[PDB]
């Protein structure tokens, strides 16, 4: 099932791209979250590609953009319990904006950004917002990307996309 597969990739990818402290906080959140995971084919190859490619993304985005603005505008840097559903809305609008066209590079950008949000949310332990972002990324993927993705060998497209 594609939605379940894509969900599992987000979790792994986030666990493999965080520092020590965040890795542990996220790993336990997921454990306690007690949610379903399948096995993704080529999963390891796909996660490696994503690390390389989100690396490409990060290195460029620190050149030409800053973070602080948007977290605030999202209401994510607060010690203040975050607005679950307001955040879905904006997230959804950002994805819709990101995805006016489809290709691998734009998909990469969705993982690199989701990472950035998740890591900022976790500074103050915003566990439910975090799980919310990951779930929304999963639905949206299943609603709008899956056909494009399956035309390109599925999630494994990333492996070749990246060389």
């Amino acid at each position: 099932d594609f939605r379940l597969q894509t969900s599992t990739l987000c979790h792994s990818f986030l666990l493999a791209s965080a520092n020590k402290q965040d890795t542990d906080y996220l790993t336990d959140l997921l454990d306690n979250t007690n949610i379903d995971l399948t096995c993704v084919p080529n999963g390891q190859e796909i996660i490696h590609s994503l690390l390389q490619l989100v690396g490409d993304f990060n290195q460029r985005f620190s050149q030409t953009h800053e973070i602080e603005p948007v977290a605030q505008s999202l209401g994510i840097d607060s010690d203040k319990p975050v607005d679950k559903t307001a955040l879905e809305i904006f997230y959804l609008e950002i994805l819709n904006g990101l995805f006016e066209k489809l290709n691998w590079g734009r998909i990469v950008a969705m993982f690199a950004f989701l990472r950035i949000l998740v890591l900022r949310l976790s500074k103050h332990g915003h566990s439910d917002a975090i799980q919310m972002l990951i779930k929304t990324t999963s639905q949206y993927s299943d609603e709008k990307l899956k056909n494009w993705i399956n035309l390109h060998d599925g999630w494994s497209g990333l492996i070749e996309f990246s060389g």
């Binding site: 993304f57 997230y91 609008e93 990101l98 691998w104 590079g105 734009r106 950008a109 060389g163």
Partner: peptide, 24 residues
């Protein structure tokens, strides 16, 4: 819209990545 804008800033970086990785 406001957040839509964000998505396209993200989109340009995406398209740069996409271009570079084309087998060209």
């Amino acid at each position: 819209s406001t957040m839509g804008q964000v998505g396209r800033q993200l989109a340009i970086i995406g398209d740069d990545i996409n271009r570079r990785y084309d087998s060209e």
